[PDB]
Amino acid sequence: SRLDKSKVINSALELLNEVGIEGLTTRKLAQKLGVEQPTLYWHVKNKRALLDALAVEILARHHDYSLPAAGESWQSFLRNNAMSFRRALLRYRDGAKVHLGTRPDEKQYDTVETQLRFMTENGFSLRDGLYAISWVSHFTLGAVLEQQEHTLPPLLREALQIMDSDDGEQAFLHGLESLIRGIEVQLTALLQIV
Amino acid sequence: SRLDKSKVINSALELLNEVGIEGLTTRKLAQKLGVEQPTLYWHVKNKRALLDALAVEILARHHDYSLPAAGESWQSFLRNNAMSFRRALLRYRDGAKVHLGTRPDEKQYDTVETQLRFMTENGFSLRDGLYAISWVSHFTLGAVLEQQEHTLPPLLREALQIMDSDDGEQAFLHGLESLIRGIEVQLTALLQIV
Ligand SMILES: [Cl-]
Ligand SMILES: [Cl-]
């Protein structure tokens, strides 16, 4: 049963959705592919290897806003990128955990390099351009991991009603906007005292 | 060998540091406590139960800045709280993952209720006071999970030198300051167009 790299990964992504990050094993993947374990091992040595491949493909398939447009503002870049990252992570079960668990890839540095060039051309130091992107990343990952994880007193109750209703999109977008404005302030200040 | 709730949890925290969140099992905890598995089961029914207990204790022991001081500014509250949360999570291996994986506790709502009362007294709606605290939380969790997880092109290189050197404290504190300023802007705007 076809053991092309593409086909292994695809069967693995399907499996990820059935069983989650814990449950997913090479033993279960071979059963799925209709193939003996030593035959799969020839192709995929371990779970670590499999997960790395998965982490790269999820972004390859869904993370479509990774490079800025022509003449785009840094603010809009960071907003579109984070929106894109977020939906790429929400696409598969435990998707955020798959991303957390893997060292970055030899395309992810090339794309991040254009991203960081873009930031330095817009007034960001380099450490600062790196930080700004890290922070948006951290914020988005944290927001997704709590959304993907989770399926008394009066005030907590009373503000619940937007905890449910919306999936987390409004809360996420409000906070992303807050974070980008804060990074603006620091940037434009240069520094007089801010 | 003493099976007090306190003593079980403490042995579990030690074990958490040895084996991490995956490795930790009830079977391994019983071996540690010098006790047969059915004897442990009387006290702790499953891993889910154990992890819940651990998640609450880590914050009970280390999260010391969970309530504002007398006359404290909302900004300073959010900054001290997040600093405190962060160090509480960095204290045990996979500490951030233990927190992610558990529904909140019947003290965590009472303390969050005072926190949210505090925010509404400082001009925050309620949904907004809740969001502000959620976002700081998300940012801190994301920052910690990437620090606890992780133990080519020219610009990426050249800004690495503060990736190492510091542990993540400077980056974290710069971004927390950015995020709080952004939340200020939105708050003080009320809204004229911001
Ligand atoms: Cl075939
Ligand atoms: Cl004893």
Domain ranges, ordered by start, for chain A: 1-65, 66-194
Q: How far apart are CA A163 and CA B109, in angstroms?
A: 15
Task: Give, in degrees to the nearest 5, the angle at Cα B57 between B177 and A98.
Answer: 65
Give A7 Cα–ligand 1 centroid separation in angstroms: 10
Q: What is the resolution of this structure in A?
A: 2.2
What b/e string do you get for A136-159 counting C-beta neighbours within 10 Å, with b at 16 or more? Answer: bbbbbbbbbbbbbbeeeeebbeeb
Q: Identify the residue whose tokens are 């974070």.
A: A179
Is-contact B74 B119, C-beta < 8 A? yes
DSSP class of residue B106 equals: T
**Considering only CB atoms, which chain A residues are within 8 Å of B120?**
155
Q: How far apart are CA B182 and CA A177, in angstroms?
A: 8
Domain A66-194, CATH number (from 1.10.357.10, 2.60.40.10, 3.30.70.2740, 3.90.1150.10): 1.10.357.10
Nearest Cα residue to B9 out of B62, B43, B50, B60: B50
DSSP class of residue B163 equals: T
Q: How far apart are CA A185 and CA A70, in angstroms?
A: 24
CA B154 to chain centre: 35
Half-sphere exposure of B108 toward its Cβ, with a 13 Å CA cutoff?
Answer: 16
Tokens, residue A26: 């090479």
Q: How far apart are CA A4 and CA A8, in angstroms?
A: 6
Residues 6+ apart with CB under 8 A from B66: B59, B81, B84, B111, B115
- Give the one of B126, B131, B158 whose C-beta lies nearest to A155's C-beta: B126
**Considering only CB atoms, which chain B residues are within 8 Å of A191?**
none
Residues 6+ apart with CB under 8 A from A84: A62, A63, A64, A65, A66
Homologous superfamily of the A1-65 domain (CATH):
Homeodomain-like (1.10.10.60)
Closest residue in B to A103 (Cα) is: B150
Q: How far apart are CA A102 and CA B64, in angstroms?
A: 32
Q: How far apart are CA B178 and CA B170, in angstroms?
A: 12
Single-letter residue type at B124:
F
Exp. method: X-ray
Residues 6+ apart with CB under 8 A from B110: A153
Q: Do domains A1-65 and A66-194 have the same CATH topology?
A: no
